Amino acid sequence: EGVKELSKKLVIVNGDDPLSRQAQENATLLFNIHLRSTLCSRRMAEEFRLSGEAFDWLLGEIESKFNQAIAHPGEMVGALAAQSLGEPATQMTLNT
C-alpha cells in the first residue's frame, strides 16, 4: 500500500484526461517499475528489514527528492543542450 500510494503520489502530467493519464504513466513508466522492483515485499522483508517509521520516512524522502528532481520551466534548455554538446566536442580530439 505504501509503494502504490507513492506511485500515485508522483505526478508529471496533471489533469484527469485519459490521454493525460496515459502520457503520465508512459512518462514515469520506467521509474515506477524500478521503484516497485526495489520495493518488492521479498526484498523489504528479507534483505532490507526496515521499520515502519523508516519506511514512511523513506517514502517522504523519495517524494521530496523527486519533487526537487522535476524540471523547472523557463530554463534555457536549448542553449544549455547546445553548449552541453559543444563542450565534449572541445574536449574530444580528432587525433584520438
Binding site: N14, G15, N67, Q68, I70, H72, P73, G74, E75
Partner: protein, 81 residues
C-alpha cells in the same frame, strides 16, 4: 477560478530569485516591512527572512503559452527551499 491550476504549485528558483531581488529592492529604499526582524541592516537578509516567512505582498503572473495568464500567490505557492 481556483480550479484551472495547470502549472505546478512548486514555485521555481527563477521565481524565488526575482521576488527576492525585488523585495530586497523596496526594503533597500525603505518601503514598510511586515515581517518581524531581529535587527539587520542589509536588505538581502531582510528579504530572505521575508521569503522564508512566506508573507510577501506580491502575486506572480505566469504566462501560459496559449496566450492566457494565471496568477499564483506566494502564500499558496509551496516553496522548494
Amino acid at each position: 477560478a481556483n480550479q484551472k491550476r495547470i502549472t505546478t504549485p512548486y514555485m521555481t528558483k527563477y521565481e524565488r530569485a526575482r521576488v527576492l531581488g525585488t523585495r530586497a529592492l523596496q526594503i533597500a529604499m525603505c518601503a514598510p516591512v511586515m515581517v518581524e526582524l531581529e535587527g539587520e541592516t542589509d536588505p538581502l537578509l531582510i528579504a530572505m527572512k521575508e521569503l522564508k516567512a512566506r508573507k510577501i505582498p506580491i502575486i506572480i503572473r505566469r504566462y501560459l503559452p496559449d496566450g492566457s495568464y494565471e496568477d499564483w500567490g506566494v502564500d499558496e505557492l509551496i516553496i522548494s527551499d
